[PDB]
Structures are given as structure tokens and as C-alpha cells.
Symmetry: C3
Subunit: 361 residues, 3 copies
């Protein structure tokens, strides 16, 4: 009968290293259709979104054939972050700012100390006898923006420590709101400029048919629209039953799903002594989580009318501040060995320990 | 009759791009001689000092002919800051520490993110097909001193957050006074050394007659002695009538006067692919506002006997801290395109937004 | 009679530039055997340990002959810090955490701004006509670890400023204890890795008989076991009698003893235009005081059962934070003149002034 369906379905779905995580998807419908208790939904909906935040980033580079590298360049970093955009809007509209303030932070740390620190250790052992070099000038424009990102986080934090100023809490707490809803346009203009610089000004250095190819970016985002409602709506009741803090599930365990394609798609290229691509994945994804996914959520709240600023807290800011400074001194010469990467791993386990202990409301 | 006066007056005064801002000068005498209300004096005395903080820096490089580049090098950065030295002493002696603590700060930010960030954007569009390079080694000695400047600002800030120490306010607030009056000699010795390094040790890389030439640096500082009394003595009553905060007039609008020659004398040289000079203007002026104009005002107060420390606040320090770090990563390779400059502009509009909103005593 | 003793004793003991500081040693026994008042013991026991924290680092490089550079490399930085390890355990077991929290900090500052800043000034004047260059790649691995060290100090500081969290003091003060006893294993694994990187993976770039040679590392540590009990047990009563603060004796005057061999063993090599060795002494000693002597004391307390965290305070952290950032921009090109060194000296006198004034319990 239909001959376009027999082996093409073998070409799209099953051609991946995570074949066994698939049939835990319909049970998360079936347990929710039945009513099995809420931590058992949460255990499956972080296993039902690993081969869907990977079989979407597979289906970006098989959509550069019909559209060209101009559109196909932009959809690289767009659909590799097609989980944080789903969750950090389903959580904003459900009064749970906590998760919108950690999951958009936990993808900035995981794209800087675990996507990146593993792809220097786990490549530097393979190419220890060869010599490794990368392109500096591709990864200097990214740290300019991450310091435009950080200063927008620093100033609403320090307004909260102006208790001397003869102002109450409800006077200063709407001074953190008005200047965060105004930094968000200045963050968007320094990303729409960053596309023009990359896709038009400096383009010097910086299988499956298409009628079916659009089809598995229709359905396999809709299941991510379903298995993000189940994560967000039941994260309280599945943190009591494990005695993990919600500032550990939202900042560590949940940014393993959202960077499950940016991780095994970067340890591909670390073994080939091509660190230019495992710096275009690790850094070029953290910028959009810095400067497009964050200052769209501040606008989306303010269009809806929900109190949300850029205040992440005093403890979260020091971790984001050191991660940008340690990453800059690691990359400032263009030659890599493995000890540059083991230091980035152990500086991520420090962030895990401080947020594992912190059992505090 | 006098033939030395006819066209020489055309040579000195009128030869500038700001011919129309001149006849707003005598009205600021005439309205003050009459008694027109105080915001109308303040509107003219920031227009009467744009072509006088430019027609003095014109009359420095026409005084290198008779004196040589040894004296003529030092008077470059001396008389381009011949407005901040006038105002930040007329405000210290009038109980208005606020302006002495912002105008000496607003010239450190404007010499790092608006003098400098415009002269990479507004040159990088002109020379986008050519290639731009500068000298790193001229602009590494300047960032050593700006980190000697910052640490002298960090420690008196953190003494104010030692409320645990079993000490009152009036015990700690004279511990911020004794260590700020003692950091100021250590800041002066690392600038008198910086002149010797530049004017004597490493000199490898680093029209109008003179009897009339001294004359228009006599009078055209005396009018700056007059139109600085009118700015300082009437800045309160001309901030109520506009509902701008005095931490916005003293930190943004007033550092457009004091850097009106350092700005159009740096966008001259950005178009010639000579960025070595638009880094000797942008950085070499911020060091003196860092390390000579600030630690002379701490001494001048203490000789007079007026309580003034180096405490600028918690909100002002984070802006000064990021501006030194973002400027260092912008300059660390010696090749410029325009996207290095648009990031420095938009990181100055963040400082404008946080101080436009802050309507707080 | 014994011929192995006559001139060999002249070879071991007296062959040093500090012959006159020796006979102040037995008086510190004799005054303690008599009972002369306690500041007179403290004045001698910082003079009895200058030619013993030098005549031990002499007797390391005369123990590379029989053991080879594999063992003899490790004993360089081990016995040059054979005073801080003695004092910061004799003070931990005597309830005086103050000194364990300053002396392990005052050797991180003195190995970065006074061992290092003098060996660029006091060499750069000698070789001002020659040109000075060093190896960058030897001194990039050291700043990776010092930022793994700093972040372990930043997070227990900021837990103390979470008074909003609906938690008391005794709830948060054991959250600073549990995460400091857990960062200390992650600090040790990134130093045992640093030995393997140096002593086995990248060994490309990075007189006296031995039966007597072991003998003068037996006795001349035992006197350092004696003259460290006399410093620690009598530092209170010899700070009242001078009106110096104990946060000045423990952070300045006492880190002149512990870096008395790392100082005149680095100004040896600064005059020979060999700055590769005066960066392997200044930086390679600060890493062990960062990442082995500190996270062993946190374990040693916790094995004994004594409340000690990594909290050093808010004032001490800013000095440690700027010292790592100013040192990185000084070394980022591999060419030195003297003005890079005078800036590091005067940024150490700022730390002296802030802790000379601070007369506060």
C-alpha cells in the first residue's frame, strides 16, 4: 500500500541511540488517563522527553536540505531549546515562578560547565597525543552578550538591599519590576543584532523527503506540549515524596532533558578534534537562553499582567557570575587539553552540592 | 589698528562645529543678573559649557608648538577634564556631596561605554571592508590602574555591611573615613608613577601665536569658573521642575558636557582606521578621573575638614565593576568590528534606565 | 674524631644570608623556661622561624640528588609551606579559628601580590634594557584552580545573608557547615588531579650526603613544631600590648615567616630574566594554600568534630576576589616590565591599610 511509510518510519523514529526510552511515553498518558499517583507521572515525563528533545534536533539538520543554511542555521539553536520554551511558559501561567526562574538558569549553567566541560575532558583523553585548537573569534561575541545578560540580573538584585532608603518593601519591589520590564527590550535588541551579524554580515567564518520532514516536527512538538504540562503541574507533590528540594529539581534534574541533544551532539564532535563545533553548540545555545528565552518571558508576563522581574536571588547570581569568568580564562588561547575540562566539571558539582542541601522554603 | 586681533579671533573662537551654542552664554549671566527662575539658568549653563569644554581642548594641541610634546602631552588629558575639576570642587564646598560622588563616577562610565563604544560602532561601519587593528600594549597599563581604583571603592562599601560586629553606625562610619583618607595617597603614587612610565621611561610607542595662545586659556577657564557655580548652586530646584532624579542629572546629563571634546575628538580618529588614538582618549582620560581627580578630592576635603569617603553605594559599584570587565574582553585581541561597539552602547543604556527610574531620596 | 661533622655543619647551617637570626631561637626556649612575659616570646618566635622556614627550603633541592625530580618536585612546594601547616593545625586544636582563617588566607595574598609583585618590579629595573618573557601555559592551569577555590568560598558567605528565608541563625549556620565539609572533597580531587597532570602527563614543559641530608629535615621541623606552639598560644596577650588588631597579625605579620623562602628564592630568579621560575614559585605555592592546605583543615576539624566552615567573612572575600582578577590581566601576554609589578605592590598596601585600622572584635 503506502510505500512512503514503511522504512521512512524506520528512518525517522528508530534511528537513535535511545530506543528504549520511547515506550515510557504512552504510559504517562495512560497513568494520567487512569490516575496513578503523581510522582509516577513525574518519573515518566522526564523519561518521555529525552528521545523527543533529541529526535527534534535530529530533524533540524535534515531540514537544511530544502531551505538552505540561512533558515537551517537558525533552527539549530531554536529547536534544541524546544523544551525550555515549552516549560517556562506552562509554568509562568500556573503561578509557579520558581521553575521559570530556575529552569531558564539551569540551562545557562549546564551549557557552560557540563556540556562544555565534558567535551574537553572526554575529547582531550582521546586526542592526548594529537594537538587541539579552535577558533577564538567565533567565541568572543558570545561572551560580550553574556555580560550584557548578567548586568541585567545584577541591578534588580541590589535594589532589594536598599532597606536604608526610607522605602518600604512594596515601593522597592515595583522598582525591581519597572526596570526589569525595560531591560528586556534592550536584551532583545542585542540578540536581533546578533543574528544579523552572524547570518548576513560575517559569513566568512562564523535522505528524508521534506513533505514528510515537516510532519515529524508537527507531532513531536505536540507530545512535548503534553509532557510539559505533566512536569509542571505536578512538581510539588513529587518533591515531597523524594525529599529533594524544588530548587534542585528545577535547576539540575530538569536541565538534563533540555540539553540532551546539545550534549551527545557535542561529544560527537569533540572526538574528531573539531572543537569549533562543540563551542558553537555549548556557547551558541547558552546565549539564546541568556538573551532570548529569558527576555521574552519578562515581556510575556507583562503582556499578560503577571508580576515577574529578573530577580533570581543572591545565591543563584554568584554561580552565574563565576561561570562566565571561569569560562573566559579557559578559552583565551585556543589550545585545549583535558585539565581545562575536569576543572569545569568539578565546578559544576559545587553547584550541585549547594543546591542539594538547601532544604529551605 | 590692531591687526593681531581681526582674523585671529576668527581663528580661535568661531572655528568649530558648535557655533550656535555660543550666544547662550551671556544670557546665563543676564538671566542671573536679572533673576529669571532657576531651571532657566540650569538649561543654559549646560549649553554654555559645550563650546567651552571643546574650545579648550582645541587650545591644547595648539600649545604643543612652543612647549614640546613633554608638556603638551600632559595638557591633553588635563584640560579635557577642565570641567569635572571645576564642578567637583564647587560642589564639595557647598555641602552637596551627591554631585561630587556622581559626576566623578559618570565620567568613568562615559569614558568607557559611550566615548569608546560609539568609536567602534561609528567607525566599524565605515571601515567594514577594511581591517581594523590597534595597539594592545598601550591599553594594558590603563586597566591595571582601574583595578587599583576599584578596590579602593570596594572596601569602604563593605565596611557598611558589618552590622554584626557589635559596632554602631558612628563607629563604622569613621572607619570608612580613616581608610579612605589613607587609600588616597596610595592612589596618587600610582599615578605619579604612571606619568614617569609614560613621559620618560617608555617613549618608544606610548597657526596661532603663543602670546595670544595663552590668552584663550585664561579667559575660557574663567567662564567655566562662572558657569560651574550656576550649575552646582541650582541643581535641586531644577530637578523638581522636571521630575528627573538628581542621581540622573549628576550621572548622565552632566557627563555630556565634561566629555564633549573627548567624544568628537575620538570619532575623528575612528574613521581614519586609527584606533590607537581613540583608545588613548577613551582610556587615558578615564584613568585620571579614576586616580587623580577622585583622590585629590578626598585630600581636599580632609585638608578643609569635611566628611567625605570613597563610599559611592551598592548600586553604583556594580555598574563600575562590570564596565571594567566588559571593556577588558572587548580589547583582548587587537582587532575590532562594529559588534564590539554596539554591545558597549546597549550596556550604557542599562545604566541609564536603572538611574532614570530610581526616584528615591 | 668525627670528620663527617666539622665542615658539613658549616655547609648545612651557616651557609645562608640570615646568620644573625639564629641565636634568637634558644632564648624563646629559655624565656619560656624562665617565664619572661608573653609578648617577648612572640617577638622571638617570629624571629626564630625565619632561618628555619628558609633552611628547610634549602634542604629540599639538596634532596633531589638521591630521589630524582619526581619526588623532588613535590617536596619543593611541600616544605616551603612547612610553617602554615604547623600553625594552622596548632591553632585549630586550641579554639582559635581566627588564625586558621587568616593565616591560610594571608598566604594566598602574599603569594600573589608581594612575592609576585616584587619579583617584577625588582627584576624589571635590572633588565629594563633587555626584554623579559615567560611561559603562559605553565600559569593558566593555576588560575583554573584558584577559581575553583574561590567559588567554594563564595557560597558559604552568601548563605549568611539569607535572613529572609524564615530560618534562624542556628539553621543556616549548619547549612554553611554541611556544604563546606562537602566542598572539601571536591577541592582535593582537583589537586590530586593537578599532580598527575604535572608529574606524569605533561612533562614536556611543566654536595651534602643523603644520610646527613635527611637528618636536617628531622630536627629543623621539630623546632618549627616548638616555635609554632609559642606563636599560637600567646597571640592574644601580645596584641593588646601593641594595640595591633589580631586580624592584622594573623594576616600580615605572620605571612612573612611562611613566605620567607618563597620570596628570596624568587628574587634570585627575577634578576636572571628567568621569570618562568618566579611564576612557578609565586603561583605554584598559592595553589596548595588554596586547594590542599585549606581543604585538609576542613576535613581535620570534621574528623575531630570541631565546627569549622569555609566562611572567611565579607571583607576578606573582596580582597581575595580582586587579587585573582588583577593577577590574570597582568600575565595575559607573556611580556613584563616593572609597571606591572608596582601596581601589584600598591594593591597589597591597600589590604594592609584596611586591616591596620580595623580595631573591631
Amino acid at each position: 500500500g503506502l510505500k512512503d511509510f514503511l522504512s521512512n518510519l524506520q528512518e525517522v523514529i528508530l534511528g537513535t541511540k535511545l530506543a528504549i526510552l520511547f515506550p515510557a511515553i504512552p504510559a504517562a498518558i495512560i497513568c494520567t488517563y487512569c490516575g496513578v499517583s503523581q510522582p509516577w507521572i513525574f518519573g515518566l515525563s522526564l523519561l518521555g522527553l529525552t528521545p523527543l528533545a533529541e529526535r527534534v534536533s535530529f530533524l533540524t539538520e535534515q531540514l537544511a536540505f530544502y531551505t538552505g543554511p540561512t533558515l537551517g542555521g537558525l533552527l539549530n539553536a531554536t529547536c534544541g531549546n524546544a523544551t525550555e520554551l515549552i516549560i517556562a511558559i506552562l509554568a509562568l501561567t500556573n503561578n509557579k515562578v520558581a521553575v521559570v526562574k530556575y529552569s531558564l538558569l539551569g540551562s545557562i549553567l549546564s551549557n557552560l560547565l557540563l556540556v562544555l566541560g565534558t567535551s574537553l575532558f572526554c575529547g582531550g583523553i582521546a586526542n592526548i597525543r594529537r594537538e587541539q585548537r579552535f577558533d577564538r573569534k567565533q567565541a568572543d561575541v558570545n561572551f560580550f552578550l553574556l555580560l550584557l545578560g548578567f548586568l541585567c540580573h545584577l541591578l534588580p538584585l541590589l535594589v532589594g538591599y536598599l532597606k536604608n532608603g526610607e522605602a518600604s518593601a512594596a515601593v522597592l519591589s515595583d522598582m525591581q519590576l519597572s526596570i526589569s520590564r525595560g531591560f528586556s527590550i534592550v536584551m532583545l535588541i542585542s540578540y536581533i543584532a546578533y543574528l544579523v551579524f552572524q547570518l548576513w554580515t560575517h559569513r566568512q567564518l562564523f535522505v528524508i523527503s521534506f513533505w514528510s520532514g515537516f510532519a515529524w516536527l508537527v507531532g513531536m512538538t505536540l507530545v512535548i506540549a503534553l509532557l510539559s504540562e505533566y512536569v509542571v503541574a505536578t512538581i510539588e507533590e513529587a518533591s515531597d515524596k523524594w525529599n529533594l528540594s524544588v530548587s534542585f529539581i528545577s535547576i539540575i534534574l530538569l536541565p538534563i532533558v533540555g540539553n540532551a541533544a546539545e550534549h551527545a551532539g557535542a561529544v560527537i564532535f569533540a572526538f574528531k578534534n573539531k572543537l569549533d563545533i562543540s563551542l558553537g553548540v555549548a556557547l551558541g545555545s547558552a546565549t539564546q537562553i541568556g538573551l532570548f528565552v529569558v527576555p521574552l518571558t519578562i515581556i510575556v508576563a507583562w503582556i499578560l499582567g503577571i508580576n515577574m522581574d529578573l530577580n533570581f536571588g543572591p545565591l543563584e547570581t554568584g554561580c552565574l557570575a563565576v561561570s562566565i569568568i571561569i569560562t573566559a580564562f579557559t578559552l583565551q588561547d585556543g589550545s585545549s587539553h583535558y585539565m581545562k575540562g575536569l576543572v569545569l566539571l568539578l565546578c559544576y558539582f559545587i553547584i550541585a552540592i549547594c543546591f542539594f542541601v538547601d532544604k529551605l522554603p
